PDB file of C-alpha atoms (C1' of nucleotides) in Angstrom:
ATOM      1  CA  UNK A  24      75.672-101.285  25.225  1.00 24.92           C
ATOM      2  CA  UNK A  25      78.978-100.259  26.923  1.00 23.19           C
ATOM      3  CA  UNK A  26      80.334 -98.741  23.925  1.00 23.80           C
ATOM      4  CA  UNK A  27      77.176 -96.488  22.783  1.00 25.43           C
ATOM      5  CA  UNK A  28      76.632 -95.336  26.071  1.00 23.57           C
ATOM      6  CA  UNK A  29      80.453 -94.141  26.719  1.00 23.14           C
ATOM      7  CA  UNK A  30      80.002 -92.501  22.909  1.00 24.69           C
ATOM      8  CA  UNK A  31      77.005 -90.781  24.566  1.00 25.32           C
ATOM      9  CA  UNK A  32      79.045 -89.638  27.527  1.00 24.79           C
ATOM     10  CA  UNK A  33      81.861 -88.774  24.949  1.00 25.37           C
ATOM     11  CA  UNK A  34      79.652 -86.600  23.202  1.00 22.28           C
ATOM     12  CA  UNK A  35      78.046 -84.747  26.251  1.00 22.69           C
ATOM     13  CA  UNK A  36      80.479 -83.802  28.196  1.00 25.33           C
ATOM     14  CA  UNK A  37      82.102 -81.143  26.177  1.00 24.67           C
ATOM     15  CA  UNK A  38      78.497 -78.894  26.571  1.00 22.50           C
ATOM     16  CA  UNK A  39      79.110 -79.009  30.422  1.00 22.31           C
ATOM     17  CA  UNK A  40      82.056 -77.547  30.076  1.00 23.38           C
ATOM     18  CA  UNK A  41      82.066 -74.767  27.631  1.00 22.90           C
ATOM     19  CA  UNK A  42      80.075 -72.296  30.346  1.00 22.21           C
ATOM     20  CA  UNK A  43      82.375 -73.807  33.056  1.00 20.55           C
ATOM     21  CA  UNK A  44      85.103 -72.376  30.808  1.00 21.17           C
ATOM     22  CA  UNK A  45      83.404 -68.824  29.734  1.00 22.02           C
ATOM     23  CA  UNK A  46      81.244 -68.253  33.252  1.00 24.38           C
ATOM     24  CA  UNK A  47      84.612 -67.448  35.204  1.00 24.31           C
ATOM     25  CA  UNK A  48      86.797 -67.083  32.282  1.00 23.67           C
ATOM     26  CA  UNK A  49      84.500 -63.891  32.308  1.00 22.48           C
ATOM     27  CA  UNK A  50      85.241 -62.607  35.578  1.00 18.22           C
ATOM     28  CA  UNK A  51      88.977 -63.717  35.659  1.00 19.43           C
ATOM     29  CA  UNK A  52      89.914 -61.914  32.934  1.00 20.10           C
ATOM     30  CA  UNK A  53      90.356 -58.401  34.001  1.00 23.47           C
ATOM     31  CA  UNK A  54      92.431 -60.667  37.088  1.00 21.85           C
ATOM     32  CA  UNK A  55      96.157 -60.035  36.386  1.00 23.45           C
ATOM     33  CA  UNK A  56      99.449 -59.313  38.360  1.00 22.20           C
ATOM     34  CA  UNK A  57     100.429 -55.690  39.694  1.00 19.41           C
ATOM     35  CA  UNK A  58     104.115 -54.292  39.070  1.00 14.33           C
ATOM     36  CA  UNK A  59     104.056 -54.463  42.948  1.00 19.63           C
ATOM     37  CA  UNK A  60     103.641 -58.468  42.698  1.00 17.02           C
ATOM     38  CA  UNK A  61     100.105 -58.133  44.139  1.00 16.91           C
ATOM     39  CA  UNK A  62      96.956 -59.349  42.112  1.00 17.18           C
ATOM     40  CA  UNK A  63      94.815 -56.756  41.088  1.00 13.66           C
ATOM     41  CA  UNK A  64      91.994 -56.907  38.869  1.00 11.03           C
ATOM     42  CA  UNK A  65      92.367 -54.622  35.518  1.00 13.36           C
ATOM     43  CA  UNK A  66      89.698 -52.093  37.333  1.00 13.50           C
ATOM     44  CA  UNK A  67      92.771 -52.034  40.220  1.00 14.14           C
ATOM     45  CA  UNK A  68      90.774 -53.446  43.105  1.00 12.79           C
ATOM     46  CA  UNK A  69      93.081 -56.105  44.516  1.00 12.97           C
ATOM     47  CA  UNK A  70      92.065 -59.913  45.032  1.00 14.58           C
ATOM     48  CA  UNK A  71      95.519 -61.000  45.831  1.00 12.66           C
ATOM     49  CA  UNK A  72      98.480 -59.611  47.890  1.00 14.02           C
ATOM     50  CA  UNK A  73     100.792 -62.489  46.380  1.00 12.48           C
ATOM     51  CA  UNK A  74     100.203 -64.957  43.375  1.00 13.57           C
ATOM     52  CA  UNK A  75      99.353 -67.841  45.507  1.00 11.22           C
ATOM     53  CA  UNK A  76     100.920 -66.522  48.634  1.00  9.75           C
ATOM     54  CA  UNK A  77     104.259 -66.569  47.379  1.00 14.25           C
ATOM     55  CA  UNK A  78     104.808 -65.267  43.891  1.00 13.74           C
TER      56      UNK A  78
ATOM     57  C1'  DT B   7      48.979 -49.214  62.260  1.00 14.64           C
ATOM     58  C1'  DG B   8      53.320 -51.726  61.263  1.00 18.49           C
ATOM     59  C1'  DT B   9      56.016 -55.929  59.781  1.00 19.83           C
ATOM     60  C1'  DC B  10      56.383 -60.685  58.131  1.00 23.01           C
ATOM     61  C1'  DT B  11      55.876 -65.536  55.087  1.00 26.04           C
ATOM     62  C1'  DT B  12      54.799 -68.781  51.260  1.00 24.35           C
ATOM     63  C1'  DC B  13      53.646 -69.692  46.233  1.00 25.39           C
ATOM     64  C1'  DA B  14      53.108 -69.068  41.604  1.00 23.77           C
ATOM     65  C1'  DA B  15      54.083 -66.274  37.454  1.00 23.05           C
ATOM     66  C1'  DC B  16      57.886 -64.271  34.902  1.00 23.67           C
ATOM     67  C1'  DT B  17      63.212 -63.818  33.106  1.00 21.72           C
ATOM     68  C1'  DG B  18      67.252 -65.642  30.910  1.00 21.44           C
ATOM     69  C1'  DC B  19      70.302 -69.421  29.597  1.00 23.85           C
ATOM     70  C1'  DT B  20      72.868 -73.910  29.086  1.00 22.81           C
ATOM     71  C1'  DT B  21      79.253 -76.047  23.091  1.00 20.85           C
ATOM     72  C1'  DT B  22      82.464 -74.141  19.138  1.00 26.20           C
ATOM     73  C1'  DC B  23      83.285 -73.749  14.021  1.00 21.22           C
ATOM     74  C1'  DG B  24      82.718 -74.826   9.414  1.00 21.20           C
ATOM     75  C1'  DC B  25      80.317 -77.071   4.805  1.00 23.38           C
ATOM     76  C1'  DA B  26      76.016 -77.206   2.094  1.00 24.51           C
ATOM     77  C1'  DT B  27      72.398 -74.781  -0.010  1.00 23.64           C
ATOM     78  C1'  DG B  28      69.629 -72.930  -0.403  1.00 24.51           C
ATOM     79  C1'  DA B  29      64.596 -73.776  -0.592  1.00 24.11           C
ATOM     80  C1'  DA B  30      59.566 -72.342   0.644  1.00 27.04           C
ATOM     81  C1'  DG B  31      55.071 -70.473   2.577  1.00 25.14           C
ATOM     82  C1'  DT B  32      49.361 -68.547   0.209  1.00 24.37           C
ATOM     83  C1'  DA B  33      44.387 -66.799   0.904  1.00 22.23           C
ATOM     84  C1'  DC B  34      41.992 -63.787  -2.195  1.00 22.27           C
ATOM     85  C1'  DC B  35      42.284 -62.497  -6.458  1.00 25.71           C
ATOM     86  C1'  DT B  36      43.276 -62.103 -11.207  1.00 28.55           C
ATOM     87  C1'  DC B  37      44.267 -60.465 -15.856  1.00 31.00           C
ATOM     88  C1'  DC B  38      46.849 -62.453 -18.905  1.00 33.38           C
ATOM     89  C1'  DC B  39      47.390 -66.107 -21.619  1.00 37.91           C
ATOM     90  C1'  DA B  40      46.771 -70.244 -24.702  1.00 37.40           C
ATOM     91  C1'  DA B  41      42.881 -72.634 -27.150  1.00 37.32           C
ATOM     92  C1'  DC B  42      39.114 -74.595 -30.426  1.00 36.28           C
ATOM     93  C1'  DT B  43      36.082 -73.371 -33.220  1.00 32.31           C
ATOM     94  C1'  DA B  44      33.422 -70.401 -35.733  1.00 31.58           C
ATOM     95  C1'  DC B  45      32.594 -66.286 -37.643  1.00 35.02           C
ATOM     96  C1'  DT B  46      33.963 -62.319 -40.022  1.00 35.60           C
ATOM     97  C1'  DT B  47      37.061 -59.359 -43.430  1.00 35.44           C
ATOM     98  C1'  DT B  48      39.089 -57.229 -48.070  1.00 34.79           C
ATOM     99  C1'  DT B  49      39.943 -57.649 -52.694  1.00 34.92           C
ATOM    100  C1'  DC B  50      38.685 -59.577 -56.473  1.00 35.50           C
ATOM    101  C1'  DC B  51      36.088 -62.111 -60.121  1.00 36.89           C
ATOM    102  C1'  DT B  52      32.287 -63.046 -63.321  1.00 36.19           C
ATOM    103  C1'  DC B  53      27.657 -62.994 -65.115  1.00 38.38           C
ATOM    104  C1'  DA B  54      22.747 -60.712 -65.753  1.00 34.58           C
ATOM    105  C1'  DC B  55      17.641 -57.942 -67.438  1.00 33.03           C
ATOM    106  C1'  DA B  56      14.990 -54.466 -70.152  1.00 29.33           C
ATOM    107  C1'  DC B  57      13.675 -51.815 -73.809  1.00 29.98           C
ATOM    108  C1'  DT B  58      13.683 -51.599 -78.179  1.00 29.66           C
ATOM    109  C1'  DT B  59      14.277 -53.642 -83.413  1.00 28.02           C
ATOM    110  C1'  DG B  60      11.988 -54.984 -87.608  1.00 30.46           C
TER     111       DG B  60
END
DNA sequence: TGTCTTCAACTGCTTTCGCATGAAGTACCTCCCAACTACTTTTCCTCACACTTG
């Protein structure tokens, strides 16, 4: 019982986290670092003064 | 006259990457086709009757 039931776990929980990958890997990707060490997003609106507050 | 609230119907997605190996619909219709048997077809073959004879 323990076994099937961890191979059903196994085999689920790589759909749950496909979208969690793509759904902000969307948004994120534009997100880089400006030459000025601030984050801007590759539009140029900035999200981040400092890469984690200290760069 | 003006603004507000709930519910139900409608929208769009919910692992990735490849092998296999592609197959199969089908009603309505049929004209074509294959069949069994009989019938028909083209060339050829061979004999036969009457009037008259003596």
């Amino acid at each position: 019982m323990a076994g099937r039931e961890g191979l059903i776990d196994t085999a689920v929980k790589t759909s749950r986290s496909g979208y969690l990958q793509r759904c902000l890997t969307k948004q994120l990707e534009g997100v880089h670092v400006s030459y000025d060490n601030s984050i801007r997003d590759a539009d140029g609106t900035l999200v981040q003064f400092m890469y984690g507050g200290d760069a």
